[PDB]
């Protein structure tokens, strides 16, 4: 599994604990888990940075008298969302993952959907890169940006739970 | 050499250095012209980085002083 | 194990009610004997000092430190009270000489008692005049056994003195001070 | 080595591997050897910590003077929680310097425990063989050769006892600190902890 | 052939196995441009100057001071010695050694085919011996002393303080010295 | 020469080479010759210094006058430390001139003790064979042939005694100077040291 995607940077194939050398047949599940984590992390990092200088106009509920511009930046912004809005967000995520972008087949654990690639959701109406060098570069860029976004989103979460902002002190 | 606590001064000079290095040209060879990194390392060596950072520092000094005279930094 | 130390008053056998052997090797038994012998000799010196000073004794004639105001007779007759009246320079001198002697005892015996050797045979500080330079090997074992027995009795003696000083009316022959 | 041929097992969890998270079979042998070394170091540190915390909570201080002007009982007047901070700075410096030297010396030894050594077998003389550094041959583990009268089977049984006691000691020292921090968490630990 | 230090950069072709201190660490490929004996000359001169500078800085800061010298810290020692007017006198041994040794040695490194290596002044009065193990020790201590003097000067200018050159002394070096109660509060 | 075939050894450090830091193993033979020469010169200097410091501490002075107007007892009216500053500068310059001549003529001899000579074997006539300089044939060491009645074994034993006494004398003179400069460090010096 040393020649697969993600083993491109200065470290080559970097598996210290050896998850995929102990179980080489478990690489596809780990790749799907990493790809979902990376995509959620890119969305989270972009939301963290963009909510600081961009805010929607108008109200959020028009019943709890809560504005888009009144939610501060972060965890407290998710606090001030009304319970119906939280229910709708969870319904959107559940419908988005259980049926539309389905990362897992199988009864309980979820292997990989058929003979597709790990993280090969959406389908049909999605850009399919030909020219395998370009496809390999695009996929490796996706994976590496996902990993960097995981670390960044974790750091901003660590900052937000001990401050009022995700910006570290001194910045 | 570094600015006195100014992060905006750091961004102008670093961006000028990166822009100059990507937009250099020696003997028709250039990163922007579609000419690969490894052989430009092979053909020029440290002369590439030295010339690029010298011109980038000149350009960054001009841009920093202009934006200081106008108002920003 | 077999070693020295045993004899009469126990039946010619080793004394250990609580086990404290059968978890000990040759190195550990050598450490046991070295610690026993050092404690024994220190305790014999300690009883010979406390008994001489507290009971009677002419005490050392002289002054003890010409500058500070102390006299040999001004130290007193109590054991612990006179030790505190010894000056700090004298205490540090005694402790430093003892430490130098034992560090050289550790670094001077090349078959170390924990790596061979004989436990309790420290270099120097024994007979400078060679009183036991002609004794037979059979007689020397008797003297070593006598040293061990007198040392154990002296260990009990020093702890009796310490108990009588700290908690009064313990050790009934020893008085309240 | 593999987690199957390892001295953890124990008779309490049915005589098999307790691992309910599947960690032992999800990683390679090098990670398992690192985990065994970390568990053993944790257990020994926790045994020392539990005994020291019990002693400091019973207010059993040394007779004498810690620093000139600072009594052992003066530091141990409060509980073990407010005790390490009452130590003078030089003493904490010397303790942590000795621990630093021990860790560096035991890690810089021939066959590392992840590269051919035995995880948890600390070398007897960590400060021996270092150029320009001389130390006495006091052994780090067993300065007195207590485990020289022990056979291989007795050594294995006492290694099993060491592992079980280290696990219990980790639970106990975390129990002590949590019982001080969160009163009423541990019912036995009353006030002075 | 990848370099030993950087496992993803290629090995520099001018550093094979000799010239003690060779860790295979040469990004920028400076060995191709700068001649390698000249670079060793410069490295070992910097190393020796930094070793003496570190020891002098720490020794003056700890309190050791020769008679009639200003009793100041090593941060203000330069200005104090210049104001006293004797710090110019240090230049004459430096001028003697540096001119009459370095200038012919640098010229012979650049010109002469057979010449002594960089740090090889053939000084060795006692006769310790210039073994390959001793050269590695010299260059390791020199690189350490270079980084050390850089850190010492930069921290001593920031704090204007005593020997540890941190904002709170050796307590910044050892975090267990500083209020372990907060660490215990999360256990 | 080699550090193995040298005369230090001694029964105090068991009977082997004492060197705990491995100084003699990292250096070549020439440095060992320099170390032995420096050790022996240090020991002889320290022996003379210890005897002179004890004589000055006992307030023992010559019957007479040091300089015209300055009695020996006038200089010795204080401790040995505040006696060197009471000697006139001319006398100390003459002492240092004789010492400089002795050191220069000792090192000027042939087979230097690194280049073939014996380390610590200062020859009998350092001021002999020098053009433009004349001296009587008073020997430096043993002007009286005391070590001419001794055999080789007695000479080796007394060389070992000299080395041991030199080491003890260095410890002693450093103790004297440190006790004067920092009082209370050496407890064996009452006031006049
Ligand atoms: C993109 C950022 C930026 C900005 C905002 C500025 C802005 C400015 N530059 Mg500037 N500059 C830049 C980039 C920039 N420069 C770069 C990349 C360089 C190359 C290193 C220079 C080199 C440069 C020089 C050498 C000079 C300026 C000067 C000026 C100022 C007056 C220009 C003028 O009126 O022309 C002048 C108008 C003319 C008609 C020119 C007459 C020419 C005859 C032949 C003489 C102005 C504040 C001038 C200045 O600081 O004056 C106070 C000046 O002398 N610039
Ligand atoms: C951090 C300390 C530590 C470490 C490194 C280990 C490591 C190990 N244990 Mg172990 N153990 C510990 C603490 C630890 N244990 C404690 C405290 C107990 C008592 C409950 C046990 C009880 C125990 C049993 C009964 C067995 C093992 C076994 C093993 C080995 C195989 C399991 C494995 O791969 O997990 C790798 C482990 C880790 C990577 C550590 C993960 C630590 C997580 C992050 C902490 C989660 C704790 C959580 C907060 C709950 C704490 C509450 C608690 C205080 C009550 C492995 C060498 C098995 C064995 O030896 O078989 C050969 C076995 O049968 N352990
Ligand atoms: C990188 C090396 C380096 C540098 C730049 C310095 C720099 C300094 N040190 Mg320093 N030091 C160093 C290494 C260094 N040190 C080391 C390694 C040690 C430990 C051994 C010390 C120990 C030390 C002490 C103890 C002191 C200094 C002091 C000083 C300061 C004044 C020095 C001065 O005035 O010199 C003046 C130089 C001279 C007087 C000698 C010049 C030689 C004369 C001109 C004759 C030239 C020779 C001639 C041609 C031939 C012989 C002639 C004759 C015999 C006939 C200055 C900031 C002093 C200070 O002010 O600190 C606060 C001070 O007290 N340093
Ligand atoms: C500066 C004085 C000096 C010098 C040059 C030597 C030199 C030598 N000694 Mg020696 N020695 C000395 C003082 C000295 N000694 C003293 C004072 C003692 C008494 C403790 C001894 C006790 C001693 C023993 C028992 C033996 C030697 C041996 C040797 C030889 C081999 C060891 C070696 O390579 O070390 C080279 C030594 C140095 C380069 C000196 C480094 C000193 C450092 C820089 C300073 C450290 C001092 C330290 C801070 C303590 C100072 C306080 C003090 C008052 C307690 C060598 C010729 C061995 C021998 O002869 O075997 C053949 C041997 O068995 N020495
Ligand atoms: C490190 C060596 C050393 C140093 C620096 C000093 C320094 C000093 N001594 Mg001193 N001394 C020393 C060793 C030393 N002593 C020794 C070893 C002895 C015992 C013999 C003495 C006995 C001594 C006396 C009795 C007096 C001094 C005095 C003095 C002070 C004045 C200088 C003077 O008159 O010198 C005199 C120094 C000597 C006579 C020592 C000579 C040392 C040589 C090397 C020995 C020669 C060998 C041989 C045995 C000498 C006799 C040979 C002859 C019969 C043929 C000065 C502070 C005087 C004083 O108190 O202040 C005025 C004084 O009255 N010293
Ligand atoms: C006024 C200054 C002066 C003069 C005129 C001389 C002259 C001489 N030196 Mg000279 N020297 C001087 C200062 C002087 N030096 C200084 C300051 C030093 C440094 C310490 C030296 C170091 C030196 C060395 C190292 C050597 C000379 C040698 C020589 C001689 C060269 C050839 C020769 O005749 O050899 C034949 C030698 C002689 C004929 C020797 C006879 C000289 C005696 C000592 C004259 C007696 C003078 C008398 C005591 C009055 C002087 C009083 C004074 C001490 C206050 C020559 C006579 C060389 C030589 O061979 O001389 C030994 C030699 O090797 N010198
Ligand atoms: C008219 C006369 C004309 C000339 C006649 C001939 C002259 C003879 C001649 O000059 O020879 C001089 C000579 C000779 C000779 C021979 O050749 C002779 C003559 C005949 C020949 O066969 C044999 C030999 C031998 C070759 C030898 C010399 C040896 C010397 C000087 C050794 C010197 C040695 C000083 C020391 C050890 C100092 C120690 C200091 C200490 C221990 C300090 C200290 C202390 C204390 C304070 C004490 C206590 C403290 O305590 C605590 C705190 O714990 C510890 C400590 C360390 O702080
Ligand atoms: C219709 C919905 C489409 C959704 C998908 C989408 O929109 O994807 C768009 C997309 C590409 C694409 C496309 C496809 C996806 C291929 C297909 C699409 O076409 C269709 C519909 O098929 C269009 C197309 C071509 O565009 C790519 C999006 C990529 C994205 C959004 C990548 C975020 C990285 C963030 C990082 C690396 C953060 C690092 C954070 C780091 C490194 C930190 O440490 C943070 C830091 O704070 C810390 C902790 C402390 C601070 O002091 C300092 C900073 C601030 C540094
Ligand atoms: C085979 C082998 O060699 O191993 C050996 C080693 C060893 C150790 C001796 C063994 C053992 C046995 C022992 C002694 C095991 C000890 C176990 C022990 C003593 C475990 C304490 C748990 C305390 C907890 C979980 C506290 C929770 C606390 C929680 C969850 C809370 O925060 C409470 C709360 O959250 C709720 C619940 C709801 C929230 O709304 C409100 C809050 C937040 C307040 C073995 C395994 O038998 C054999
Ligand atoms: C043949 C053979 O075997 O040779 C023999 C020779 C010989 C002589 C017979 C032998 C012997 C026996 C003897 C008597 C050995 C004696 C050894 C002895 C007596 C050794 C004292 C050390 C005192 C020290 C280090 C003081 C430190 C002082 C220190 C560290 C300080 O306080 C300095 C400091 O306060 C300052 C100044 C200010 C600040 O900076 C802070 C600090 C706190 C750091 C041997 C060993 O058996 C070997």
Strand ranges in F26-146 using DSSP code E only, listed in sequence order: 65-67, 70-71
Q: Which two tokens stand for residue B47?
A: 């002369």
Q: Which residues, other chains included, contact E139 with Cβ-Cβ below 8 Å and sequence gap of 6+? A: E20, E21, E43, E44, E47
Q: F25 in helix, strand or coil? A: helix
Find chains touching chain B: ≥3 CB pairs under 8 Å. E
Cβ–Cβ < 8 Å for A60, A71:
yes
List C-alpha distances in Å: C11 to C36, D173, E93, F62. 21, 48, 85, 73
Contact of E7 with E25, CB cutoff 8 Å: no
Nearest C-alpha in A relative to D23: A19
Tell if the CB–CB gap between A17 and D25 is shorter than 8 Å. no
| Residue in the structure block whose two tokens are 């060879």 | B29
Neighbours of E38 (CB within 10 A): 13
Q: Closest by alpha carbon to D92, among E163, E179, E165, E162?
A: E179
Cα distance between residue A146 and residue E75, in whole Å: 48
CB-CB contact of D85 with E179 (8 Å): yes
- Contact state of F29 with E128 under an 8 Å Cβ cutoff: no
Q: In terms of Cα–Cα distance, which of D6, D26, D2 is closest to D120?
A: D6
Residue A22 among known ligand-binding residues? no
- Chain C residue at shortest CA distance from D139: C114
User: C173: Cβ–Cβ under 8 A, 6 or more apart, which residues?
Assistant: none
Report the distance separating Cα D114 and Cα D111, nearest Å. 8
Angle of the E132-159 helix axis to the E36-62 helix axis, nearest 10? 50
Structure tokens at B29: 């060879």
* Nearest-neighbour CA in chain E from D34: distance (Å): 24
d(CA A47, CA A40): 10
C-alpha F166/C-alpha F176 separation (Å) is 15
Burial degree of A149 (CB within 10 A; 0-12, 13-18, 19+): buried
What angle (nearest 5°) sits at the alpha carbon of residue A86, between those of residues A81 and A92?
135
Residue among D3, D19, D28 whose CB has most ligand 2 atoms within 8 A, to mutate: D19
Q: What's the distance, Cα to Cα, between the start and end of chain E in Å? A: 50
**Rounded (5°) CA angle D135-D136-D142:** 120
Please state, in angstroms and rounded to a whole number, the distance separating the CA atoms of residues E7 and D179.
50
Test A18 with D25 for CB contact under 8 angstroms: no
Separation of alpha carbons A155 and A44, rounded Å? 12
Q: Going by beta carbons, is chain B in contact with chain C, meaning 3 or more pairs sit under 8 Å apart?
A: no
CB contact under 8 A, E184 and D174: no
Tell me the DSSP string of F145-162. -GGGSS-HHHHHHHHHHH
Question: What's D154-183 look like in SS3?
Answer: HHHHHHHHHHHHHHHHHHHHHHHHHHHHCC
Answer yes or no: are the C-beta atoms of F80 and F48 closer than 8 Å.
no
- Give the separation between CA C150 and CA C41, rounded to whole angstroms: 9
Instruction: Return the number of other C-beta atoms located less than 10 Å from residue E143's C-beta.
Output: 16
What is the C-alpha separation between A63 and B27, in angstroms, rounded? 68
Cβ atoms of residues A146 and A42 within 8 Å: yes
Angle at C108 between CA C107 and CA C110, to 5 degrees: 95
Integer Cα distance of E175 and E180 in angstroms: 8
Using a CB–CB cutoff of 8 Å, tell me whether E68 touches chain A.
no
Angle at C155 between CA C154 and CA C160, to 5 degrees: 90
Give this entry's resolution in angstroms: 2.8
Between CA F34 and CA F44 the distance in angstroms is 15
- Return the ∠ at Cα D37 (arms to D35 and D42), rounded to 5°: 90
Interface of E with B in 10-69 (CB under 8 A): 28-30, 32-33
Torsion (CA) A94, A95, A96, A101 in degrees, nearest 10: 110
How far, in Å, is the centroid of ligand 9 from the Cα of E151?
A: 48
Identify the residue whose tokens are 């009246």: C85
Q: Which atom of ligand 6 is nearest to the CA of F131?
A: 62
C11 in the Ramachandran plot: left (φ > 0), alpha (ψ -120 to 50) or beta? left
Nearest CA to ligand 5 atom 34: F66
CA distances from C38 to C33, C105, C119, E57 (A): 8, 12, 10, 49
Task: Please state, in angstroms and as integers, the Cα–Cα distance from residue A62 to each residue in A65, B7, D47, F153, following that order.
Answer: 5, 41, 60, 112
Q: How many whole angstroms separate alpha carbon D157 and alpha carbon A166?
A: 52
Enter the DSSP assignment of E101: I
A and F touch with 3+ CB pairs <8 Å, answer no
Residue linked to tokens 């290629």: E10
The experimental technique used to determine this model is cryo-EM
Cα F18 to chain centroid distance, Å, stands at 22
- B26 backbone dihedrals φ, ψ, rounded to 5°: -120, 125
- Ligand 7 pocket test target in C87, C97, C98 with most atoms within 8 Å of CB: C97
Mutation target among F21, F23, F24 for the D interface, most CBs of D within 10 A: F21
Q: Which of F56, F52, F55, F76 has its CA nearest to residue F64? A: F76
How is chain B split among helix, strand and coil, in percent rounded to 5? Answer: 65, 5, 30
CA distance E73 to E54: 14
Residues 110-129 of C with CB under 8 A from D: 112, 114-115
Is the CB of residue F3 below 6 angstroms from any atom belonging to ligand 4?
Answer: yes
Residues of E in contact with D179 (CB under 8 A): none
Kindly state whether C68 is in contact with chain F, defined as any CB-CB distance less than 8 angstroms: no
Q: Which strand (E) or helix (H) includes residue B39?
A: helix B37-44
CA of E100 to the centre of ligand 2 (A): 68
Contacts of D82 in chain E (CB under 8 A): 181
Q: Which of F3, F22, F26, F85 to mutate to test the interface with E (most CBs of E within 10 A)?
A: F26
Q: Hey, which residues 97-116 in chain E have their CB within 8 Å of chain A?
A: none
Listed in sequence order, the residues at least 6 apart from F6 whose beta carbon sits closer than 8 Å to its beta carbon are F32, F36
Beta strand F70-71 pairing with F65-67: antiparallel
Whether C92 contacts chain F with CB within 8 A: yes
CB D107 within 8 A of CB D114: no
Distance CA C74, CA F56 (A): 32
Say how far apart CA C55 and CA B30 lie, in whole Å.
104
Q: Distance (Å) from the C-alpha of residue D94 to the closest C-alpha of chain E?
A: 11
What is d(CA F72, CA F14) in angstroms, rounded to the nearest whole number? 46
Rounded to 5 degrees, what angle do the CA atoms A101, A103, A107 make?
120
CA neighbours closer than 13 Å in the CB half-sphere of residue D134: 7
Residue F75: other Cβ atoms inside 10 A? 21
């Amino acid at each position: 599994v040393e020649t697969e995607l993600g083993a491109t940077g200065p470290l080559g194939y970097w598996d210290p604990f050896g998850f995929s050398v102990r179980n080489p047949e478990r690489f596809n599940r780990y790749r799907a888990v990493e790809l979902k984590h990376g995509r959620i992390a890119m969305a989270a990092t972009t939301g963290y940075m963009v909510q600081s200088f961009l805010r929607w106009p108008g109200y959020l509920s028009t019943s709890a008298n809560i504005k888009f511009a009144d939610l501060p930046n972060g965890i407290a912004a998710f606090k001030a969302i009304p319970p119906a809005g939280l229910f709708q967000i969870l319904l959107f995520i559940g419908a988005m993952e259980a049926f539309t972008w389905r990362y897992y087949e199988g009864p309980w654990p979820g292997k990989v959907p058929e003979g597709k690639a790990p993280g090969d959701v959406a389908g049909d109406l999605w850009v399919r890169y030909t020219d395998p060098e370009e496809k390999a570069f695009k996929l490796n860029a996706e994976i590496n940006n996902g990993r960097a976004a995981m670390m960044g989103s974790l750091g901003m979460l660590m900052h937000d739970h001990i401050l009022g902002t995700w910006v570290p002190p001194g910045f | 050499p570094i600015p006195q606590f100014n992060p905006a001064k750091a961004f102008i000079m670093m961006f000028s250095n990166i822009l100059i290095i990507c937009t250099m040209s020696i003997q028709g060879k250039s990163l922007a012209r579609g000419t690969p990194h490894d052989e430009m390392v092979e053909s020029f060596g440290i002369t590439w980085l030295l010339a690029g950072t010298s011109l980038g520092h000149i350009v960054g000094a001009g841009a920093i002083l202009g934006c200081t005279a106008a108002g920003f930094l | 194990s077999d070693m020295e130390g045993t004899g009469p008053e126990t039946g010619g056998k080793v004394f250990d009610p609580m086990g404290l052997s059968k978890i000990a090797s040759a190195e550990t038994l050598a450490w046991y004997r070295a610690a026993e012998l050092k404690h024994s000799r220190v305790a014999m010196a300690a009883v010979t000092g406390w008994a001489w000073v507290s009971s009677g004794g002419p005490l050392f004639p002289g002054y003890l430190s010409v500058e500070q105001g102390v006299t040999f007779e001004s130290l007193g007759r109590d054991g612990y009270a006179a030790w505190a009246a010894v000056p700090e320079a004298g205490k540090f001198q005694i402790l430093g000489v003892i430490g130098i002697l034992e560090i050289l005892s550790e670094s001077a015996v090349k078959p170390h008692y924990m790596a061979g050797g004989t436990p309790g045979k420290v270099p120097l500080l024994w007979d400078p005049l060679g009183f036991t330079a002609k004794l037979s090997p059979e007689t020397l074992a008797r003297k070593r056994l006598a040293e061990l027995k007198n040392g154990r009795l002296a260990m009990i003696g020093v702890m009796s003195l310490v108990s009588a000083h700290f908690i009064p009316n313990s050790v009934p022959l020893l008085p309240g001070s | 080595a593999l987690v199957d041929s390892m001295e953890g097992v124990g008779e309490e969890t049915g005589g098999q591997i307790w691992d309910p998270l599947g960690i032992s079979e999800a990683v390679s042998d090098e990670a398992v050897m690192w985990f065994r070394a970390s568990e053993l170091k944790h257990g020994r540190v926790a045994m020392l910590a539990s005994v020291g915390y019990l002693v400091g909570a019973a207010k059993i201080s040394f007779p004498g003077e810690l620093a000139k002007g600072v009594t052992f009982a003066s530091v141990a007047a409060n509980g073990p929680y407010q005790a390490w901070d009452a130590v003078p700075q030089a003493g904490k410096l010397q303790i942590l310097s000795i621990i630093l030297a021990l860790e560096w010396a035991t890690e810089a030894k021939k066959p590392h425990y992840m590269r051919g050594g035995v995880p948890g077998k600390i070398e007897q003389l960590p400060f021996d063989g270092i150029q320009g550094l001389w130390a006495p041959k006091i052994k780090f583990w067993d300065p007195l050769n207590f485990t020289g009268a022990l056979s291989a089977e007795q050594k294995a049984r006492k290694r099993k006892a060491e592992l079980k006691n280290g696990r219990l000691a980790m639970i106990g020292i975390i129990s002590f600190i949590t019982g001080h921090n969160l009163p009423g968490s541990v019912p036995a630990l009353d006030s002075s902890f | 052939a990848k370099s030993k230090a950087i496992p993803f950069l290629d090995a520099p072709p001018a550093l094979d196995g000799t010239m003690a201190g060779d860790k295979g660490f040469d990004p920028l490929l400076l060995s191709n441009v700068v001649p390698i004996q000249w670079a060793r000359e410069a490295e070992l001169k910097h190393a020796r100057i930094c070793m003496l500078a570190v020891v002098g800085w720490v020794t003056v800061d700890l309190g050791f001071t020769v008679p009639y010298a200003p009793q100041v810290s090593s941060l203000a020692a330069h200005d104090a010695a210049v104001d006293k007017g004797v710090f110019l006198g240090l230049l004459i041994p430096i001028a003697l050694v540096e001119v009459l040794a370095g200038i012919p040695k640098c010229f012979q490194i650049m010109n002469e085919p057979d010449a002594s290596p960089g740090g090889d002044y053939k000084f060795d009065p006692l006769g310790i011996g210039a073994s390959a193990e001793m050269q590695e020790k010299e260059i390791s201590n020199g690189r350490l002393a270079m980084l050390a003097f850089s850190g010492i000067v930069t921290q001593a200018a920031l704090t204007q303080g005593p020997f540890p050159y941190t904002y709170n002394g050796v307590e910044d070096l050892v975090p267990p010295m500083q209020s372990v109660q907060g660490a215990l509060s999360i256990l």
